[PDB]
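The following record pairs a protein chain with its ligand, zinc ion.
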Amino acid sequence: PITGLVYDQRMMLHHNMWDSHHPELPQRISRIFSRHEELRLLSRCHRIPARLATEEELALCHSSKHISIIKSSEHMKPRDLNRLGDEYNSIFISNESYTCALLAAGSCFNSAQAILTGQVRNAVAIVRPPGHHAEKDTACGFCFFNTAALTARYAQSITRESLRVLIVDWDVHHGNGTQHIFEEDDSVLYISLHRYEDGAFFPNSEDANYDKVGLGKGRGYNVNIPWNGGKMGDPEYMAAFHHLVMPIAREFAPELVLVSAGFDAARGDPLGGFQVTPEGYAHLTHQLMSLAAGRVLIILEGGYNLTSISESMSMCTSMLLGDSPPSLDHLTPLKTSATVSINNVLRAHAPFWSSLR
Ligand SMILES: O=C(NO)c1cc(F)c(Cn2nnc(-c3ncccn3)n2)c(F)c1
Ligand SMILES: [K+]
Ligand SMILES: [K+]
Ligand SMILES: [Zn+2]
């Protein structure tokens, strides 16, 4: 009956030496932690220590080349760091980055171990830099290694290869890397809600559309929920959870739930354009607690409004600690285009999931 929490200030060391106001700020994690202390949620949690991932553990999802190129960034002078960052889509690198990326992955491993040993029921990980855009062979969108994908493999490596892991990615951006790593896999169901705008919204690829349902034995186990036609909030996320996420998760019956918890769909986020409220995030969290006998790990991805990500993640920890879900005052019907999105996903996944028929 215990919630784990991992936070280590050394993860603030990764910074953008060229643009000190880049939105992926060191103080993202320090501001979330401070807010957990102000709401007296910290002292109610079990503190799980951070550790570095090993290179063997990074090879769970990533190639030797990729691991080696990022490792090499530790010793690089700024000129070479700049040159390295520019070989990927929207990466900045510092001396401390590789170590911050290892610490974000090892923290989630220790969290996943605490859950699967029974030391805790569920856990939150306040880590940076984020992960879901990192693929097997490259870095992308502020992500070096895919934290959530590596945690899924780590779980299976201390239990059994077929341990059923559900990854729910409610970060506003599509987890291009998560999807690719597990696209052929029936043991790991990936479900992403994301702004799409027919490929105008980052990371700008048709891989994030609803018709990408997975390949081979993993056909059905890749569920994309792409939003089009501007602003979305609590009503559209509640609806997608009611008709898609929760019916598909129940018929999959995960033994562990991982949340790629970006808070960039928050009211206030300058990159997302959405209005998902802190209470919206609490409801999403509370529904997922109904799965896998409550074995949920919430992993920080994006979210760039310091007040919004502080309020929203603290609100998710409150649900994990077993607090009553807040009143939404849900009084809104769905945007026309969010209904069109949900029926598109229901038509494409009904061949695979009996509960959408
Ligand atoms: O992980 C992400 N969200 O959670 C994420 C990753 C991304 F690469 C992008 C795209 N982008 N590249 N550069 C920038 C940028 N740079 C400086 C000032 C403003 N904007 N935005 C994103 F919009 C979001
Ligand atoms: K997503
Ligand atoms: K999959
Ligand atoms: Zn994002």
